[PDB]
Amino acid sequence: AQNPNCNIMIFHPTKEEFNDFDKYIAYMESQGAHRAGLAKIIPPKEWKARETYDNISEILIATPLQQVASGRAGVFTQYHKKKKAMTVGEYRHLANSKKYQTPPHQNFEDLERKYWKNRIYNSPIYGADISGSLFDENTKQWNLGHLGTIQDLLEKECGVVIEGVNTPYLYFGMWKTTFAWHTEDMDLYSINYLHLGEPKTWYVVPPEHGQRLERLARELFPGSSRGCGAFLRHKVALISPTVLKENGIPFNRITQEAGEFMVTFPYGYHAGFNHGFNCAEAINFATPRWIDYGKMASQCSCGEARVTFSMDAFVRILQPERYDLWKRGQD
Numbered sequence: 001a002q003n004p005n006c007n008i009m010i011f012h013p014t015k016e017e018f019n020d021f022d023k024y025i026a027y028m029e030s031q032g033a034h035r036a037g038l039a040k041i042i043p044p045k046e047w048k049a050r051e052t053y054d055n056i057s058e059i060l061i062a063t064p065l066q067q068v069a070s071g072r073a074g075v076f077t078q079y080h081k082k083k084k085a086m087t088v089g090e091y092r093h094l095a096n097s098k099k100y101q102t103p104p105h106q107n108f109e110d111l112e113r114k115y116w117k118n119r120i121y122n123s124p125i126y127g128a129d130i131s132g133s134l135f136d137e138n139t140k141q142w143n144l145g146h147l148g149t150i151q152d153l154l155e156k157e158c159g160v161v162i163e164g165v166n167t168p169y170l171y172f173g174m175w176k177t178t179f180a181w182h183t184e185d186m187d188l189y190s191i192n193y194l195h196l197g198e199p200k201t202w203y204v205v206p207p208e209h210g211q212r213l214e215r216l217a218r219e220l221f222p223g224s225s226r227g228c229g230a231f232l233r234h235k236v237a238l239i240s241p242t243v244l245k246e247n248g249i250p251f252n253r254i255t256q257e258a259g260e261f262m263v264t265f266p267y268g269y270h271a272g273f274n275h276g277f278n279c280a281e282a283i284n285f286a287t288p289r290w291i292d293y294g295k296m297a298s299q300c301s302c303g304e305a306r307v308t309f310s311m312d313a314f315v316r317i318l319q320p321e322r323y324d325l326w327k328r329g330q331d
């Protein structure tokens with residue numbers, strides 16, 4: 001069995017290996033990368049996502065979100081307070097202001113310590129889930145807006161033809177902006193490219209051990225667990241590495257830098273934070289190996305999780321018994 005310890009693997013494809021996306025995902029899996037839940041891909045030196053970023057300040061963040069925490073430093077939830085629209089240029093200046101800028105620090109480890117100690121006492125502002133792409137149309141390799149669609153994968157594997165589309169999203173972050181513990185919708189893969197700026201730290205639980213994280217989360221957030229049997233789908237709960245280690249939950253951590261891809265694998269729980277002003281692009285995707293995870297994915301039916309148009313068909317085809325209840329929570 002490859003990668004039995006479930007370590008995060010890092011890959012350095014050559015330019016030739018970077019041509020066929022599906023092939024290279026299958027290669028990483030042959031080496032056991034999926035067992036970690038997360039992999040890093042460093043693009044060949046000959047590759048570029050676009051020529052420059054000198055022209056991005058005019059993008060609009062229609063609904064910036066202020067991430068307000070409740071709880072204790074290691075175990076907290078966050079809610080999103082909507083803020084007035086701002087451009088990327090406005091947001092970058094905000095990020096770099098004295099109130100929001102990254103503090104002085106020695107190294108990534110010192111910054112991680114400061115994050116876990118102090119995050120709850122501040123409310124950073126995140127530009128999330130902005131439909132769009134920063135890949136140049138002429139970039140042919142690993143262009144996140146030109147991937148094979150999940151609808152097409154389900155059609156090829158299962159023969160059924162469904163509605164829905166699959167497009168990328170932009171994320172603009174600052175110091176302390178936070179992604180809560182989650183798996184993807186329908187336990188899909190994700191791929192994330194850090195276009196520019198300061199790093200993103202990731203934490204991940206191996207897919208084979210995801211239910212250990214779920215059990216701890218029910219213990220730590222007991223009212224939330226009573227409200228919903230899949231409340232991690234709400235994407236609001238944070239648990240620190242120190243708390244995970246205290247409770248024996250297997251996990252790994254890694255820091256992504258600008259110019260690097262991360263792939264999350266089906267049912268790989270992940271969480272993290274941004275080090276300072278940055279811009280990432282991400283999208284969900286599927287492979288044949290996903291289909292069994294899609295069929296077994298938990299679902300939120302309490303109303304809170306509310307998701308895209310395209311998840312309807314996934315539930316309807318893969319999970320017909322659950323469909324009527326889930327759709328009630330959509331409506």
Ligand SMILES: O=C(O)CNC(=O)C(=O)O
Nearest residue numbers: 171179190191192280282
């Ligand atoms: O970058 C973020 O804020 C969160 N991204 C992801 O959860 C991802 O790519 O799957």
Ligand SMILES: [Mg+2]
Nearest residue numbers: 055056058059
């Ligand atoms: Mg612009």
Ligand code: NI
Nearest residue numbers: 183184190264
């Ligand atoms: Ni994710």
Ligand SMILES: [Zn+2]
Nearest residue numbers: 228300302304
């Ligand atoms: Zn719910």
